[PDB]
């Protein structure tokens, strides 16, 4: 991972111009940062998401390089994703971490992220509303006051989101 590192002078150059407007970070020696990647590549009745192996490799490596222990879970149902998110919320390493990253990669629709058993006939969907709920202050007190970065790759099966115009 080629993450451009932050120098000490540059770090305090950031710490000065914006004082108490920056989330506090724990010391490098005794912090236990966690990050969770759920990625669906193989599905029951919807097209295989090839080159997701490259997205997993990429994201893990990067998150690792930003100091996160990365779990990686593959090909789950919405019920399985929910359970997995529940487990992640009650991980004790959070109490001694300053933040977290969640990464979801799958097929998307209106409602949200497609599970593996999904079909347009028998829907298997996890909704974004549910991800936030399991990670909020109430249902996850250890991550309270700490930045939670959710990253979602949920391509909708639509026509390209571009248009032509006369110039």
């Amino acid at each position: 991972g080629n993450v451009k590192l932050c120098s000490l002078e540059e770090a305090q150059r950031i710490w000065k111009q914006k004082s108490a407007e920056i989330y506090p970070i724990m010391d490098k020696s005794s912090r236990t940062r966690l990050a969770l990647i759920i990625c669906n590549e193989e599905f029951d009745s919807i097209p295989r998401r090839t080159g997701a192996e490259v997205d997993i490799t990429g994201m893990t490596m990067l998150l690792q390089n930003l100091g996160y222990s990365v779990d990686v879970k593959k090909n789950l149902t919405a019920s399985d994703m929910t359970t997995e998110l529940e487990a992640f919320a009650h991980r004790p390493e959070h109490k001694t971490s300053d933040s977290t990253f969640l990464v979801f990669m799958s097929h998307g629709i209106r409602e949200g992220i497609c599970g593996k058993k999904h079909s347009e006939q028998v829907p298997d969907i996890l909704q974004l509303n549910a991800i936030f709920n399991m990670l909020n202050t109430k249902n996850c007190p250890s991550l309270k006051d700490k930045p939670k970065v959710i990253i979602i790759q949920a391509a909708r099966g639509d026509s390209p989101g571009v248009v032509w115009f006369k110039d």
Binding site: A11, A20, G51, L128, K144, I150, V162
Partner: protein, 88 residues
């Protein structure tokens, strides 16, 4: 003693729901959204906060030409700037 807390605070989501179906030539290609997220994270994690890095990601995707993406930042309840401080 008891204190009051917001139930939903300190969230930031970054989503690409712009259609991204598999390429015919080289199907084992990595998603460009992810690739671009990674390149900007690698370059700007040291100097910009995430809310900004997500914008920079958008700025780089401003002109459609090949694989066209325009990812949104959603559900932001960040009250402070989140700086990753790489290697600190």
């Amino acid at each position: 003693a008891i204190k009051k807390a917001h139930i939903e605070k300190d969230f930031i989501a970054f989503c690409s729901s712009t259609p991204d179906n598999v390429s015919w030539r080289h199907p084992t290609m990595g998603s460009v959204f992810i690739g671009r997220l990674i390149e900007h994270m690698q370059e700007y994690a040291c100097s910009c906060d995430v809310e900004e890095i997500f914008r920079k990601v958008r700025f780089s995707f401003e002109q459609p030409d090949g694989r066209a993406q325009m990812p949104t930042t959603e559900r932001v309840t960040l009250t402070r700037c989140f700086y990753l401080f790489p290697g600190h």
